[PDB]
From a paper:
The mononuclear iron site activates dioxygen for reaction with the substrate, and the Rieske cluster transfers electrons to the mononuclear iron site during the catalytic cycle. All Oxy:Fd structures solved consist of one molecule of Oxy (comprising three subunits: chains A, B, and C) and three molecules of Fd (chains D, E, and F), and the asymmetric unit of the crystal contains one Oxy:Fd structure.
Oxy: Fdred-CAR provided the same observations as those of Oxy: FdCAR (2’), which were a clear density for a flat aromatic compound in the active site and the CAR-binding-dependent movement of amino acid residues Leu202–Thr214 and Asp229–Val238 toward the entrance of the substrate-binding pocket in chains B and C (data not shown). In chains B and C of Oxy: Fdred-CAR, the average bond lengths between mononuclear iron–Asp333OD1 and mononuclear iron–Asp333OD2 changed from 2.0 Å to 1.9 Å and from 2.6 Å to 2.2 Å, respectively, which made the coordination of the carboxylate residue to nonheme iron clearly bidentate. The slight movement of Phe67 in Oxy: Fdred-CAR was common in Oxy: Fdred, in which the single-crystal microspectrophotometer clearly confirmed the reduced status of the Rieske cluster. This suggests that this slight movement of Phe67 may be specific for reduction of the Rieske cluster. In the case of CARDO-O, reduction upon substrate binding triggered displacement of the nonheme iron and residues including Asp333 away from the substrate, which increased the accessible surface at the mononuclear iron, opened room for dioxygen binding, and allowed binding of an exogenous sixth water ligand.
Numbering used by the authors:
A (entry chain B), C (entry chain A), D (entry chain C): 1 to 389
B (entry chain D), F (entry chain F): 4 to 107
E (entry chain E): 3 to 109
Write the structure that this text describes.
């Protein structure tokens, strides 16, 4: 919805909405923190899709209010005043809102005001799943969470563990950094490769049949929308890198077979299967904070039937998986994303980029995202919708 | 139940007339063509008086921030307004306009 | 003029000039420092209404020149060179100017230049009153200083003492916070309230009609323009803050009654009387430096009949009033002003703000300022007025 | 091409191109470093005319490649990977280019890619002369280096030594700071003046014949274009600085006669003859890095007939000329250039500046530069030239 | 081989494009401008887009990915970001049948 | 006192002629249609020669920064010029152009 120069949008006819979605897609669920990070009665702040939000846990349930008073637009979080269990009072003129529905229920500075009961602060649905806090940054009653999650993430036996941080790049550069079969060249020296004895080529190149390697999913019963890049089953693993015909670098000839298939799903979550070990899966979100930043929400899933396994998995995670994979492997993806910022900062990169074969899957994602997103977030959504209808 | 606003002829089409009520919030009577309508005078977006606004057809634009309402349904017509305005029943009898004491 | 999106100005029909006055009002007197801060032959720099200025004291009298050489536009203050008592020579090409009228009287690098005596550096009137330095940031002959000062500030026996600092918020946010009848809520825990046994409600339940909420002064004997906050005339003070009918906070039940008289005056100075003690007054200016900052020029006045009383007052000021009131009370106003920056930084808050009853006082000020200001400062005044035939 | 507001360019009919050339002139040679600073197989990064470049030395010869991968536009220099002697491999997806012609010769992650051999990274000619590295930031076959160098710089026996650094000001402010006969007023207290017994007036003012003092050169056989300000033979040295007829400052009455003539040449190099000693010459470039910065490339030349004379000059350069002249004299020029930034930052300074007689030479330079430059560098050149059929 | 059979001249309306796939080689694109026929590589030289999926405006083909364009007669770039010329293949009509060269022109 | 400048026909309509005066600042004589006017030649904003500028009607545009003046009143017509130009009455008699020696 008009976030980019019109001259540029007219040029990218195949995926203009995607290029315009600089602030992310509205009306989708997004993970922003882990359940253990938000305690009972201790509001936490965060910015999602450019909007400042407040999250609080009351009687164990999470509630989300926009962190901007309706009166003079100050953030309530500058000085939090929760005077009753179910409400929050602005520190300025004491306009008081209910966490459950955002209604302005009282105003301490003028209990007779005509505004009481007649105004409502924006609220957003919040749901906890797999120890992760998801916020529906949208309007109207929310769709089921599964619609915006990759396959198997919500499986009963699937134990989820991970980490989250803020990275300085637009969310799309992160998505395309993750859903890229040839970028793993940057991970050729990661400690996970040797230390976990992985079989990892320098890159996965397009196999014989292109129509078989890329699988667009828009028929999932759950409503999921995404694209598969079947690199393992239809791609070609390049293990020997040559220059002028001379081998200058080789891939990893380990025993553990990983990354059989990768898939990217709206609103922007990647699934790598299996990874970082043959018996695990990696699910990572690239959540838009503002046009220049995103949350890099990493999670690793491993089936567990009992606490003894869960505890064992949790122990391995802290001692190996987190330090060796999430960090040891993905840390290079961080500066890689930061390195693409300049080229796309003026939006011109969306026109001047020179793609090659392995980027076919990314193009498929751009079209899927353009066609199936549930809304283009705009700066007007951030400040206040504007219209003369 | 009904208050005498003014003579239907005292209002030129496309004009607004504020109606103050004793011990109560003021109302706004609009004449769109040959029909009359009424809503609360105070804009739902703040403390502005709509009777001091500008009427364009059946839409009243608030003088403070430019928000607007359809005077027939009281529904928001322009941002930043979002809260429906309270509408009051109006009736013309013997050339004189009357407004209901309570919103319909 | 034309400092804000025309679409926004068209929307705020009640006070468009005020919203447009992002850089302040031109052709008004503004206090910028205290007399004791500038000594004989020691030029001082400062920025007022976006303009860099130089102030010097020669033979006891103050003079103000624009701190921008006519030649290549450098600030003369980068390397001050006052080679004779009545002039200042630019450090670059030696263009020399008279402090008295700003005339280019000499050019050391070209004594016979035809530009000599044909160009003039902008000068602004400067006046000292009550130990304060006021600059008339405007054109032509200045009006009496009395026009731009609150009643009684210039009274013969009024002893004025104060403090000044740079605050990071647009000047208007500061003005409105000061004149805001309900913002008193933020001062509920001030040390001044308890330590000086002040009576301080949390707010007011308005009484009477809209017209009775304020008293607009369109003309004084000297042409003053201002508004008095009369919310306490027919309004009910709120001492018990409730939420859902339950008491969650109470005002201060002190015996000392202060601030019974509150008025804001163009170009932007508040008068609170009496405050912070029954026998004194507070006059404070919110002076525009640039679009994002202002001078918070605070003063406290107490009538004194002799040098003994003035000495005693000076002692009380330094040991009690300054730390307990000017800082202990008003420091909270400082961060409150800063908290409103984001909402208005894109000029959207001037459209989206949801006001309530006590804001009648702010609306009256916005209208008065819009109707009686002596000119809108523009970036063009800063760089150089532009006009093409 | 549209680097500046058209309204402003239309106002400066005498030198619009010059005012538009905020990023510098394309299709000219520019010195960017000294030869001893770039070693065999040691890639070095730099920004010239807004473009990020990579320079490397292979078998002694210098090569220049645009530091931006054709694929996703990242800077190859983030993680330099020169797998083979003649190439550099992007750290991201491994696209590989030849330093010699910028041709994409290999792709380690997809050796079968159809892009191989059909894409080419931008390359720029590089030439080493007098121990200085010159890059032809232009397109097509380059002209002789001599065209963009001041007279005598390339003389067989001229020994060149220098220093280079990045200064925070647009290159034109630097050019006009150097080619300005009156600005030397700022150097009146330089240690060089007394320590090298120089005869230096407060400024050189216009003589009785302007057409004789300024000499526009556009008939040079090597094609160089420039302007001479014959301050020594046609100008008037001002030694007594007066204010109101009284002497407040005098120049230096040393014995060494320097600065007989100054000349500025496209693309932007000044020649001061003789300086800083009667038997030496100073040649300095103000190289555009981006719109706000430039390389201040200083060189001092002194004829030397053999290695003994060269090593002697080198020792004198390090012990005297560099600290006393290049630094002791020109250091004041640095903050002087920074001081002009504000006035010209909004491009308004090019309209509001008030010139005087001595600026006549600068005006001649602006005209010559507008008329004989070989191209206006634009932001589109930096991001990627654009054109619709 | 030398001349590849494409289709009947009448099977193409003016202003249309037809993709010609080839065994073991890159695809071609045949364009009909008026009653004349031209042909170039099908793959845009700026990336991986298929020009046969673009839009023909006279004798200029516009790539659907980034808006680049080429003159179908000369194969020269007509709009940025395209800079590399397309290979052009001769087209001839034999007894109402459209044939495209198997090898591009050398120049 | 008056200074004989030139023959009226020596100047084509819409042109400007610089008139030098030894020991004094040069003047600029403008021919607007068949009328003649005069002012100081030096722009009041710098060192530019107005005689080298562009005449549009009765307004001369400085060639340096686009400043302008009305050649009849000498008053600024366009920024950055702020200081009024010196005006010299011109008189045409028997086809000869004369300009006052002193600014009046
Ligand atoms: C190909 C192979 C592995 C990966 C990939 C693309 N993208 C990834 C993102 C996170 C973790 C692993 C991978
Ligand atoms: C006049 C006289 C000397 C100099 C000058 C102008 N410009 C200069 C720049 C560098 C070094 C010396 C000079
Ligand atoms: S800004 Fe929150 S109550 Fe006024
Ligand atoms: S008060 Fe009516 S639009 Fe704001
Ligand atoms: S910039 Fe001040 S004398 Fe030149
Ligand atoms: S960004 Fe360089 S090979 Fe992909
Ligand atoms: S692929 Fe054709 S313009 Fe980029
Ligand atoms: S010198 Fe005439 S407009 Fe500046
Ligand atoms: Fe990665
Ligand atoms: Fe306050
Ligand atoms: Fe200098």
């Amino acid at each position: 919805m008009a976030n980019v120069d019109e001259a540029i949008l007219k040029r990218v006819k195949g995926w203009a909405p995607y290029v315009d979605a600089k602030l992310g897609f509205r009306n989708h669920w997004y993970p922003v923190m882990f359940s253990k990070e938000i305690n009972e009665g201790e509001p936490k702040t965060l910015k999602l899709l450019g909007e400042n939000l407040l999250v609080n846990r009351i009687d164990g349930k999470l509630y989300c209010l926009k962190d901007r008073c309706l009166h003079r637009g100050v953030q309530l979080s500058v000085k939090v005043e929760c005077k009753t269990k179910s409400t929050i009072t602005c520190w300025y003129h004491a306009w008081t809102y209910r966490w459950e529905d955002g209604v302005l229920c009282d105003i301490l500075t003028n209990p007779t005001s005509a505004q009481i009961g007649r105004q409502k602060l924006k609220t957003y649905p919040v749901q906890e799943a797999k120890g992760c806090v998801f916020i529906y940054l949208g309007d109207g009653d929310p769709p089921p969470l599964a619609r915006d999650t990759p396959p198997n993430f919500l499986d009963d036996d699937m134990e989820i563990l991970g980490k989250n941080q803020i990275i300085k790049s637009n969310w799309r550069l992160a998505v395309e950094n993750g859903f890229d079969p040839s970028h793993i060249y940057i991970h050729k020296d990661s400690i996970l490769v040797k230390d976990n004895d992985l079989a990892l080529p320098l890159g996965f190149a397009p196999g014989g049949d292109r129509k078989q390697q890329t699988r667009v999913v828009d028929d999932d019963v759950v409503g999921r929308k995404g694209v598969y890049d079947l690199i393992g089953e239809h791609g070609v693993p390049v293990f020997e890198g040559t220059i002028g015909g001379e081998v200058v670098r080789e891939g990893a000839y380990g025993e553990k077979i990983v990354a059989n298939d990768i898939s990217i799903w709206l609103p922007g979550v990647l699934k790598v299967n299996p990874f970082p070990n043959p018996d695990m899966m990696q699910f990572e979100w690239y959540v838009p904070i503002d046009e220049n930043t995103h949350y890099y929400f990493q999670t690793l899933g491993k089936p567990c039937a009992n606490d003894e396994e869960r505890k064992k998995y949790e122990q391995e995670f802290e001692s190996k998986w987190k330090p060796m994979a999430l960090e040891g492997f993905n840390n290079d993806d961080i500066w890689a994303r930061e390195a693409m910022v300049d080229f796309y900062a003026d939006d011109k990169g969306w026109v001047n980029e020179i793609l090659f074969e392995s980027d076919e899957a990314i193009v498929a994602w751009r079209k899927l995202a353009s066609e199936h997103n549930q809304g283009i977030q705009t700066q007007a959504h951030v400040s206040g919708l504007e219209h003369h209808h | 139940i009904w208050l005498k606003v003014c003579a239907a002829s005292d209002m030129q089409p496309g004009t607004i007339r504020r109606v103050n009520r004793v011990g109560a919030a003021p109302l706004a009577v609009y004449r769109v063509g040959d029909q009359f309508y009424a809503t609360e005078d105070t804009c739902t977006h703040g403390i502005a008086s709509l009777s001091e606004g500008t009427l364009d057809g059946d839409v009243i634009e608030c003088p403070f921030h430019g928000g607007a309402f359809n005077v027939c349904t009281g529904m928001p017509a322009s941002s930043p307004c979002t809260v429906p305005l309270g509408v009051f029943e109006v009736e013309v009898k013997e050339g004189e306009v009357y407004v209901a004491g309570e919103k319909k």
